[PDB]
Amino acid sequence: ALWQFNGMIKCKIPSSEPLLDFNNYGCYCGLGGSGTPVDDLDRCCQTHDNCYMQAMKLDSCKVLVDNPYTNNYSYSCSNNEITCSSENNACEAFICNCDRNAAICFSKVPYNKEHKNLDMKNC
Ligand SMILES: COc1ccc(C(=O)O)cc1
Ligand SMILES: [Ca+2]
Hints:
This protein is mainly alpha-helical. The protein has 5 helices and 2 strands; from the N terminus they run ααααββα.
């Protein structure tokens, strides 16, 4: 879920509060998304959004009422390395992977403050 993703991003980037630094950034980082990504970080979020859209189409995810933002899964952080647990079922695992790839993406690309709270009229 959302809380897991927060800790997952702090695992890769120890000095930030993901819910603040990465929320409402560009056209995709944050609830929703549309238009052409403004930068790679925004592209990281785009991919993450597609990943979620994909997960929602899994027979295994449809059975449960939990939302990708509200579905708790298991993972660990160790030596700043993220590991999705094998105790996770199909749906959770898929989501866990979506969040893992996004966290790493976040930590490998530039951050442009100018894009924080971007005017959704650029999307
Ligand atoms: C806490 O950071 C994020 C970043 C991107 C996504 C999103 O697009 O909703 C969610 C949370
Ligand atoms: Ca989004």
